[PDB]
Amino acid sequence: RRRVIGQRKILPDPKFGSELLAKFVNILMVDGKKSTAESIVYSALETLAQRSGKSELEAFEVALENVRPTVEVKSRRVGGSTYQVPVEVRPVRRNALAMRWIVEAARKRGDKSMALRLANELSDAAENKGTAVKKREDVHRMAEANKAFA
Amino acid sequence: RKQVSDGVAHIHASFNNTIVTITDRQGNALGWATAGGSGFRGSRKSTPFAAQVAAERCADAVKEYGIKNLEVMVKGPGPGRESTIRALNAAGFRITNITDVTPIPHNGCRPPKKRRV
Amino acid sequence: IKVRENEPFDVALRRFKRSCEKAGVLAEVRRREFYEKPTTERKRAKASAVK
RNA sequence: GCUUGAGUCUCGUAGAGGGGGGUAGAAUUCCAGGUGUAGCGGUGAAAUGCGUAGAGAUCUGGAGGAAUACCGGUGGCGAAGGCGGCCCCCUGGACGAAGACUGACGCUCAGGUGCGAAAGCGUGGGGAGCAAACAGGAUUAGAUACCCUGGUAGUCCACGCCGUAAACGAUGUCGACUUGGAGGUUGUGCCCUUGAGGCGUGGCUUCCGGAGCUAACGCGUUAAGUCGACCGCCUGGGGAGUACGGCCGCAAGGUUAAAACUCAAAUGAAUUGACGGGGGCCCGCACAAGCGGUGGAGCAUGUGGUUUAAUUCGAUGCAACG
Numbered sequence: 195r196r197r198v199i200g201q202r203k204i205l206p207d208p209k210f211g212s213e214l215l216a217k218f219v220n221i222l223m224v225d226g227k228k229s230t231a232e233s234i235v236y237s238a239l240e241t242l243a244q245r246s247g248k249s250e251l252e253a254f255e256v257a258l259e260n261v262r263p264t265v266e267v268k269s270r271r272v273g274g275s276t277y278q279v280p281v282e283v284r285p286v287r288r289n290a291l292a293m294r295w296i297v298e299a300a301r302k303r304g305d306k307s308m309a310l311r312l313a314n315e316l317s318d319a320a321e322n323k324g325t326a327v328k329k330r331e332d333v334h335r336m337a338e339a340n341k342a343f344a
Numbered sequence: 345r346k347q348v349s350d351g352v353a354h355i356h357a358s359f360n361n362t363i364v365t366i367t368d369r370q371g372n373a374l375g376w377a378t379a380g381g382s383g384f385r386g387s388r389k390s391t392p393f394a395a396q397v398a399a400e401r402c403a404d405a406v407k408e409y410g411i412k413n414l415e416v417m418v419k420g421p422g423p424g425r426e427s428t429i430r431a432l433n434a435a436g437f438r439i440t441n442i443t444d445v446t447p448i449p450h451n452g453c454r455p456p457k458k459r460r461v
Numbered sequence: 462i463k464v465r466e467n468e469p470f471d472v473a474l475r476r477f478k479r480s481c482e483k484a485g486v487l488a489e490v491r492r493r494e495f496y497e498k499p500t501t502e503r504k505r506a507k508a509s510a511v512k
Numbered sequence: 513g514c515u516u517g518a519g520u521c522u523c524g525u526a527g528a529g530g531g532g533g534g535u536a537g538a539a540u541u542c543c544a545g546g547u548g549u550a551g552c553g554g555u556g557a558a559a560u561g562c563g564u565a566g567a568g569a570u571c572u573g574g575a576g577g578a579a580u581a582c583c584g585g586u587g588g589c590g591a592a593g594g595c596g597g598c599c600c601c602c603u604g605g606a607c608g609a610a611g612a613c614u615g616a617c618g619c620u621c622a623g624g625u626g627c628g629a630a631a632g633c634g635u636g637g638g639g640a641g642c643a644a645a646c647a648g649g650a651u652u653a654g655a656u657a658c659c660c661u662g663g664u665a666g667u668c669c670a671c672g673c674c675g676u677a678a679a680c681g682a683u684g685u686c687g688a689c690u691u692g693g694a695g696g697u698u699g700u701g702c703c704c705u706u707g708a709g710g711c712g713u714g715g716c717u718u719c720c721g722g723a724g725c726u727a728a729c730g731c732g733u734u735a736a737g738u739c740g741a742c743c744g745c746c747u748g749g750g751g752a753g754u755a756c757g758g759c760c761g762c763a764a765g766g767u768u769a770a771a772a773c774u775c776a777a778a779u780g781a782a783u784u785g786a787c788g789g790g791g792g793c794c795c796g797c798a799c800a801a802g803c804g805g806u807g808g809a810g811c812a813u814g815u816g817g818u819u820u821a822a823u824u825c826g827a828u829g830c831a832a833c834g
Contacts, residue, residue, distance in 0.1 A: 195795070195796075195797095195798090195799095196794095196795080225804095268800095273556095274556070275556065275557090287801095294802090340388075341393050342384065342388050342389070342391045342393060342394045343391065344393075352570095354569070354570060356568090356569060356570090358553095360553075360554060360555080361552080361553085361554095363551095363552090363568080363569065364569090365548085365569050365570060367547075367548090367569085367570050367571080368547080368570095368571095370546090370547085370571065370572090371546090371547075371570055371571035371572080372546075372547035372548075372570075372571070373546095373547045373548030373549080373569075373570055373571090374547080374548075375548085375549095376548075376549075376568090376569060376570080378550090378551070378552085378568090378569090380551065380552070380553095381550075381551065386555095386557075386558090387554095387555075387556085387557075387558095405549095417570095420487070421483075421484035421487045421488065425484075426475075429471075429475075430471070433471040438469060439469065439471070440465070441463065441464050441465045442464035442474075442475050443462050443463055443464060444462045444478065444482075444483070446482075446483075446487060447538085447539055447540080448482055448486055448487070448538070448539075448581070449490075449538055449539030449540075449579085449580090449581070450537070450538045450539070450579080450580050450581045450582090450597080451538095451539095451579050451580050451581060451597095452538070452539045452540065452578070452579055452580075452581095452640090452641085453539065453540045453541085453577095453578070453579075453640070453641040453642080454494060454578075454579075454641055454642050454643095454667090455490050455491070455492065455493055455494055455641080455642080456492070456493060456641085456642065456643090457492075457493040457642075457643075458492055458493060458659090458660095459492050459493075459659080460658065460659085461658055461659065481582080482581085482582090486581065486582090489581095493642090494642095503584095504586075507585085507586050508586075508719095510586080511586080511719080
């Protein structure tokens with residue numbers, strides 16, 4: 195409610211050691227079976243070699259670029275009815291949010307297996323594909339697209 | 345294809361809607377805009393940032409001449425008395441004089457009772 | 462209400478005339494009139510202006 | 513006889529006091545024409561409605577009616593009701609000051625006469641805007657409403673009628689007394705009048721408040737305080753400001769004004785709290801942010817049903833149902 199502290203410092207990736215990738219595995223994690231999450235994403239994250247052939251590291255961030263929004267809505271119980279006054283999105287959630295769309299939509303892909311069903315999505319991310327990239331504009335069509343209230 | 349060069353611009357700023365017409369010097373229609381005609385309708389218009397996109401549409405119909413300068417006629421209150429003039433200042437047009445031509449009587453006619461909820 | 466300035470710029474000067482008429486004596490009309498509602502509320506709002 | 517009450521005269525002052533006649537500017541609507549083009553208008557949304565027979569917008573010219581932004585105020589004038597643009601004509605009252613004059617000529621006032629918001633009525637005018645009725649559209653369970661699009665009487669004028677209002681300060685008129693403070697408006701005397709100005713002395717008027725008064729709220733030199741003169745009025749609530757009769761009215765209806773029967777109260781202010789689709793400030797996984805569910809599915813369990821000879825009794829809004 196009124197509580198005001200700090201964020202929960204997360205433990206970096208099991209290898210590259212990166213908070214950005216840390217909360218990534220967590221957002222992807224399920225049933226506290228964190229192990230699988232690693233062995234499911236950490237693989238597809240490197241399986242990019244077969245998909246490219248180099249130091250697959252920045253590919254992740256570059257892939258998220260096509261999935262990084264900067265405007266969202268927010269209904270407000272004002273003016274009798276309910277406003278929508280859209281507002282941008284700070285970095286703290288930008289990177290986070292995206293990760294959800296990248297995973298929460300990579301599951302309904304319906305491919306070989308979550309391990310790979312995820313990999314492909316990354317390539318589709320930077321190359322614009324799947325609901326992941328969709329959600330962006332499908333969301334932007336509200337904010338910045340309806341500044342009439344913003 | 346007349347090239348009026350310069351002509352005042354009336355800004356009928358109302359509540360339920362706003363419309364700006366870039367008429368000529370004498371007062372002839374050269375190009376008018378409209379929030380209702382600016383995609384969004386219903387009531388989503390009104391808002392200033394919604395009228396600006398309307399009047400700006402004139403620079404697409406009244407641009408056939410070559411208005412190098414123009415005044416502004418703001419009439420009636422509502423979200424479109426400022427927005428309009430602004431969008432016009434960016435559209436590339438000039439300016440010669442801003443004025444409010446809102447009909448302010450001297451207790452003449454008796455306004456409608458109306459509203460009572 | 463009459464604006465006019467040299468050196469093209471969209472400064473303002475406009476809200477200067479916005480202190481004598483403008484959206485005020487406008488909305489004043491807008492809806493119905495007043496009659497007894499004013500002479501009263503006009504003489505009660507006056508009480509407010511005391512402290 | 514007298515002059516301080518009351519009044520007259522003089523000279524000034526302020527005023528939306530009244531009656532008549534003019535006149536000005538802003539805006540609305542409408543008519544005509546130019547430009548220009550697919551929307552306008554409206555609402556919470558919408559829809560009715562208006563638009564390609566060209567609206568809306570815009571500009572030019574014209575017609576007409578109503579009301580007078582700013583000044584405008586806690587302001588002013590009036591017996592009350594009420595009275596706002598500027599100009600003229602006829603007219604009433606209030607106040608101050610040197611004074612001069614009359615000489616108690618005064619106060620109140622049943623009955624009586626007259627004036628009375630708005631709505632309404634009659635005859636004849638007028639009619640822009642607004643708007644009972646009425647008609648559409650919407651809302652809703654319904655919506656003979658609130659909202660929206662229209663709109664007739666009416667609102668305006670003359671002349672006559674009706675006399676009511678929370679016609680309220682809910683506080684009759686006239687007079688004399690009784691601590692104070694701040695302010696408004698208008699007259700007058702005075703002060704290096706050297707000033708915006710400063711000191712008094714009258715009229716009217718706001719707000720606070722002392723004594724006192726008051727059931728309390730509150731009133732408090734403009735009293736609801738202390739007194740005096742005259743008048744109107746009240747005597748529990750309902751029935752009822754009704755019936756009947758009279759009087760008045762064109763008619764609405766007004767005025768005067770009961771009983772039967774019925775209840776044990778009706779009522780006034782103030783206190784405590786509860787509540788408010790009142791306000792201010794707060795906290796709770798209350799919401800918002802997410803993670804996973806229930807609602808569908810098969811099975812478990814309980815319950816209401818239904819059934820049964822019995823389906824033992826209980827638990828039933830959050831606080832009832834593994």
